[PDB]
Amino acid sequence: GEWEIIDIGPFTQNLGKFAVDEENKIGQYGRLTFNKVIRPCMKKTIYEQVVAGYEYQLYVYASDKLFRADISEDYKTRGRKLLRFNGPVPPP
Amino acid sequence: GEWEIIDIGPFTQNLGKFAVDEENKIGQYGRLTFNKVIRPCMKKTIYEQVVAGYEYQLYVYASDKLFRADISEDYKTRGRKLLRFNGPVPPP
Structure with missing residues (x-):
């Protein structure tokens, strides 16, 4: 596909809150507490x-x-x- | 694939009938009569x-x-x- 860099705004931050929430359901890493998302964030279009x-x-x-x-x-x-x-x- | 040579024949001839039929609506070349389509015929897929x-x-x-x-x-x-x-x- 095509690749692009997006910044670390509220949309990107909530993408990180999504990932930490799903990982906490699996339960292999132990209770994680979301902190922040940092650069660089990559978005791929399929x-x-x-x-x-x-x-x-x-x-x-x-x-x-x-x-x-x-x-x-x-x-x-x-x-x-x-x-x-x-x-x-x-x-x- | 972008550009290709297609063969002449039944499907290509009907394209030739269409172009003449459409052009007879304009009339800048006068009443034409479809004869045949000849090589080379190009097809461009979009x-x-x-x-x-x-x-x-x-x-x-x-x-x-x-x-x-x-x-x-x-x-x-x-x-x-x-x-x-x-x-x-x-x-x-």
Whole structure:
């Protein structure tokens, strides 16, 4: 994922109070009393990659002339859109 | 994967019909007639990064000892969970 440093404000402090509370439930370290959280605190963002859509670069012949088309497609709705249409273009 | 050559043929031809159909609505090239789509055809996949959750690495003091806590948070439920809790560790 992506990593970033956050500071030691009340949100970060309560993250430390969470960890000490859960550890005291397990009971392997003995009764711990939360003191403070110090720098550096690291926050990692976990992502899932998913397809938003597609794009296409076409060479299409129409009425015996050759054009360049640029189409986009949405993954979920399957709806298309024509972005560009230039011609006549020389063959590739 | 970002950019790729896709083959021509049935799915590609229907993209060529769409581009001509859309362009016939504008009319700057006049009434066209779809002929065929030729090589090379490019496909560009567009991905979307959605957040699955977060993870925090902390340096926590408790009962005058310094521990390293790894806690996790969900993006949808916002629920916290302690993954690891080791110590004492040397300070940064």
